[PDB]
């Protein structure tokens, strides 16, 4: 049984914790301590293979060095968090000395109306990085499994 080391990064308040908690426990957390950084484990079957996911919810050096894939999370109603994504990717590139790192761009809070980041904008950013873009709602669970499992499938191409 395989293990995949995943790291969830992005600006404050985008839903890093809510996404991770939704994935693990199938529950939307209305407020989760913004200072709690911890790693969580989750047994999954992905394309017929039993895997143990090891997920760091950032809020650390060891996981950046050995982490195999990163979720770059912004919120679709938080333009600053989207603009911040560049800086998070630059930090990952430095720690990995590579711009060929498994990553998925995640636009969270898709259940909220009147988005300020268009899907097109995010698709264009992900295209420039050569990575997938996936929209999620930690509230409704839409796309949550897709985001984490796609990151696994990106790691497997590596
Ligand atoms: C609401 C609280 C919250 O969720 N936070 C998330 C973690 N975090 C954070 N802040 C931050 O300034 N950097 C960072 C550093 C330390 C240096 C340069 N740039 C940045 C940002 C602007 C990209 C964070 N950097 C990382 C990170 C490192 O250090 C290495 C590789 C990959 C990374 F994502 C990180 F995980 C969190 C950073 C604050 C906002 C609190
Ligand atoms: N409506 C909605 N709210 C969300 C979603 N994800 C997170 N939130 C809310 O956004 C706030 C910040 O979420 P949190 O997980 O703590 O963000 P973090 O700082 O990146 O860990 C919380 O009040 C969450 O309830 C979502 O998909 N939809
Ligand atoms: Mg958090």
Numbering used by the authors: 1 to 59, 68 to 166
Provide the publication's sentences verbatim.
Ras GTPases are involved in proliferation and migration, and their aberrant regulation is implicated in cancers and developmental diseases, termed RASopathies. Recently, the discovery of a cryptic allosteric pocket (switch II [SII] pocket) in K-Ras4B has challenged this paradigm and enabled the rapid development of therapeutics to target K-Ras(G12C) mutant cancers, including the FDA-approved drugs LUMAKRAS (sotorasib)14 and Krazati (adagrasib)15 for the treatment of non-small cell lung cancer. Herein, we systematically map SII pockets across members of various GTPase families and find that, despite limited sequence homology, key elements of the SII pocket are conserved across the Ras, Rho, and Rab families of GTPases, enabling the targeting of many GTPases beyond K-Ras.
To study whether other small GTPases also exhibit a targetable SII pocket, we first turned to the K-Ras paralogs H-Ras and N-Ras, which exhibit sequence homology in the SII pocket but differ in position 95 (Q95 in H-Ras and L95 in N-Ras). Both H-Ras and N-Ras can also harbor G12C mutations, which have been validated as cancer targets in pre-clinical settings. We found that some inhibitors were relatively selective for K-Ras(G12C) over H-Ras(G12C) and N-Ras(G12C) (e.g., ARS1620 or adagrasib), while others exhibited very effective labeling of each Ras paralog, with full modification in under 5 min (e.g., sotorasib, JDQ443, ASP2453). To study how the difference in residue 95 affects the binding pose of an SII pocket inhibitor, we solved the crystal structure of sotorasib-bound H-Ras(G12C). The Q95 residue is located in closer proximity to the sotorasib binding pocket, which leads to a slight shift in the binding pose closer to the unresolved SII loop. This suggests that the SII loop remains flexible in the presence of a SII ligand and may be less critical for pocket shape and ligand accommodation compared with residues found on the α3 loop. To study whether the effective SII pocket target engagement in H-Ras(G12C) and N-Ras(G12C) translates to inhibition and cellular activity, we characterized a small library of 10 compounds that were initially optimized for K-Ras(G12C) in biochemical and cellular settings. Both N-Ras(G12C) and H-Ras(G12C) exhibited markedly increased thermostability in their sotorasib-bound forms, as tested using differential scanning fluorimetry in the presence of SYPRO™ Orange. To assess functional inhibition, we tested the nucleotide exchange activity of unliganded and sotorasib-bound N-Ras(G12C) and H-Ras(G12C) using a fluorescent guanosine diphosphate (GDP) analog (BODIPY-GDP) in the presence of the guanine exchange factor (GEF) son of sevenless (catalytic domain, SOSCat) or ethylenediaminetetraacetic acid (EDTA). Sotorasib inhibited SOS-mediated exchange and significantly reduced the rate of EDTA-mediated exchange in both N-Ras(G12C) and H-Ras(G12C).
